[PDB]
Design a binder for these strands. Structure first.
Ligand code: MET
Ligand SMILES: [Mg+2]
Ligand SMILES: [Mg+2]
Ligand SMILES: [Mg+2]
Ligand SMILES: [Mg+2]
Ligand SMILES: [Mg+2]
Lengths: 141, 124
RNA sequence: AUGCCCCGAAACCCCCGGGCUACACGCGCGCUACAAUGGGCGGGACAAUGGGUGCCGACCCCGAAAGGGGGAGGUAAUCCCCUAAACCCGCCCUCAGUUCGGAUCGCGGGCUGCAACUCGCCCGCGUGAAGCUGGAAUCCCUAGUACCCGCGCGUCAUCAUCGCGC
RNA sequence: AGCGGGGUGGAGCAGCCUGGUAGCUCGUCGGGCUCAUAACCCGAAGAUCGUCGGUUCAAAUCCGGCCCCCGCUACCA
């Protein structure tokens, strides 16, 4: 029955944690989204992650593939209105990382202001830079 | 490798009404278009359409840093004032939805020199 | 307000776009924390000062939220802002960079305004930096005072980690 | 060519005989105190140890050949 390690979607999950908190180890799933997927799958969010069966893991991964098709609202995904296809998508792990990298690269290609700010490693959302954001060594007079 | 904005090609974006296009832009651009264009932007758009028709074979220079880039503007070159000069901008398809002023920086990049007298407590 | 000296077709009067918001670095005053003298979820209690016609808006309907469409009463001891938080009860977490901390960044939705890129504020999902109590030094305070907790007005089309008060 | 000695932050020593931090004075940078300067107090950067191996749970130094340096002597083309 109990397993101290369970692997879901290429990530090893603790078996002693509650399922809702165990699922947060996946990059791209927070506590709220995990609770949503647990409720959609018809599983108690407070159950130990170590009591899962293979069919339940398969169901969870299937839900993670296309959450909108399984009843999750369109405003709860982490990439609505995709730039290429125009659909509402949810991404995790490597695909999420490369999507973010592609967004920043697209900004850099057209030489937009935010692209230059990303290149130079400077604040992007309009902060002041005279006092804070200091990371370096003191220069002598 | 072709360009698509929400699953639509550039030609499909060309044959769209202004109201139809606004449903694909983000919230800020949709609100700005819903409130209408300022008279200066009207004159600039008239010049752009005239250039597209095959007339007005002259450089296009403007002060309208807050004009939203539209699909019908792709392929031209526009000179946007940055405070003291007009810099050339070549409009690419991936610029749809951005303000012109985003491509004409107003400040020069900083290269720091030696700290002067009074920069530290002991130097005063 | 005002003497003298200067400019007097510009150093006067308007309009457009920028800047005062830059960033190897030194310093002042603060906010948020480094967790159990807690974090989260559900439930239960008790204020005062002030302000309102270019305005305050109860009550009904739509929306997950921010918000949207109508709209009684009020020139005010009459109507509205206005059913505060710290506090108490039950359940989960048990000393861990974590169910502590929330900086930074991606996508999407809104409001004010003639205009939101430079350079505004709000909401949803995602991401998850330093920080594990602080050297030499140094500040405020004697009673409904200090500490801790929120609220009102000024500024104000929109914007409060501020000032003056409760 | 023979004999002897040691190579330790920017400088000068500890650090090996008795193995447990790479430590002590000066120097550079930053902050305190003062109306301000000097004196005085605090913090930080800076030598992964000069290469391999033997010892040890543990040392560089305890030892060994290499890297070059320093001192003395021999040395009649
Ligand atoms: C002196 O004696 C001389 N000739 C010796 C040899 S020189 C290479
Ligand atoms: Mg200023
Ligand atoms: Mg937390
Ligand atoms: Mg902005
Ligand atoms: Mg701790
Ligand atoms: Mg001094």
């Amino acid at each position: 029955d109990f397993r101290h390690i369970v692997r879901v979607a290429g990530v090893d999950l603790d078996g002693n944690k509650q399922l809702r908190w165990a699922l947060t180890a996946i990059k791209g799933v927070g506590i709220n989204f995990a609770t949503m997927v647990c409720r959609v799958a018809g599983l108690d969010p407070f159950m130990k992650a170590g009591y899962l069966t293979d069919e339940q893991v398969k169901k969870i991964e299937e839900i993670l593939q296309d959450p909108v098709a399984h009843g999750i609202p369109r405003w709860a995904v982490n990439r609505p209105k995709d730039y290429e296809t125009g659909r509402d998508l949810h991404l995790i792990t490597a695909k999420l990382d490369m999507a973010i990298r592609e967004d920043i690269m697209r900004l850099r290609r057209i030489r937009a202001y935010r692209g230059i700010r990303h290149e130079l490693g400077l604040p992007v959302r309009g902060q002041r830079t005279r006092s804070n954001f200091r990371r370096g060594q003191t220069v002598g007079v | 490798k072709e360009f698509r904005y929400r699953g639509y090609t550039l030609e499909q974006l060309m044959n769209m009404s202004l109201e139809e296009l606004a449903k694909l832009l983000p919230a800020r651009q949709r609100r700005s278009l819903k409130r209408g264009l300022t008279p200066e932007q009207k004159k600039l758009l008239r010049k752009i359409r005239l250039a597209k028709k095959g007339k007005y074979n002259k450089p296009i220079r403007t002060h309208c840093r807050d004009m939203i880039v539209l699909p019908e503007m792709v392929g031209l070159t526009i000179y946007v004032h940055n405070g003291k000069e007009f810099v050339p901008v070549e409009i690419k398809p991936e610029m749809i939805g951005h303000y012109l002023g985003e491509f004409a920086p107003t400040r020069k990049r900083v290269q720091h020199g030696a700290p002067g007298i009074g920069a530290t407590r002991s130097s005063m």
